[PDB]
Amino acid sequence: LPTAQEVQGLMARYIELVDVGDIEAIVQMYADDATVEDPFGQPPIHGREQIAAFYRQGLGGGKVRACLTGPVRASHNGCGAMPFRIEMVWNGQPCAVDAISVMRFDEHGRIQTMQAYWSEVNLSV
């Protein structure tokens, strides 16, 4: 179970992997039975294949950038939350999303649950 410092490291690493677009490396951060709710409010997806498909759809387009917009907030029970911004292209036009990711890690340091808070009010095209 990651310490608060280790959570800061892991969640920062996740953003780095999204930024360079390494689908396989992202998927390996997840527990094999992990759930993802992105955006929060939508039905969860379950398991590494479904999670792989999700990131392939989102990042497979090639030109996606992601960065922390503030520090990772970490707990002492293997959880954390971070503010970030994703920049993509739908239109040929640049668009961006401001989001917050909340993660719970398991006792092996893998992501058990991820929830991403955002909606169209956080979108700019």
UniProtKB/Swiss-Prot annotation:
<dbReference type="InterPro" id="IPR037401">
    <property type="entry name" value="SnoaL-like"/>
</dbReference>
<comment type="subunit">
    <text>Homodimer.</text>
</comment>
<keyword id="KW-0443">Lipid metabolism</keyword>
<dbReference type="InterPro" id="IPR032710">
    <property type="entry name" value="NTF2-like_dom_sf"/>
</dbReference>
<keyword id="KW-0413">Isomerase</keyword>
<feature type="active site" description="Proton acceptor">
    <location>
        <position position="38"/>
    </location>
</feature>
<dbReference type="InterPro" id="IPR039256">
    <property type="entry name" value="Ketosteroid_isomerase"/>
</dbReference>
<dbReference type="Pfam" id="PF12680">
    <property type="entry name" value="SnoaL_2"/>
</dbReference>
<feature type="active site" description="Proton donor">
    <location>
        <position position="14"/>
    </location>
</feature>
<keyword id="KW-0753">Steroid metabolism</keyword>
<feature type="binding site">
    <location>
        <position position="101"/>
    </location>
    <ligand>
        <name>substrate</name>
    </ligand>
</feature>
<dbReference type="GO" id="GO:0004769">
    <property type="term" value="F:steroid Delta-isomerase activity"/>
</dbReference>
<protein>
    <recommendedName>
        <fullName>Steroid Delta-isomerase</fullName>
        <ecNumber>5.3.3.1</ecNumber>
    </recommendedName>
</protein>
<dbReference type="GO" id="GO:0008202">
    <property type="term" value="P:steroid metabolic process"/>
</dbReference>
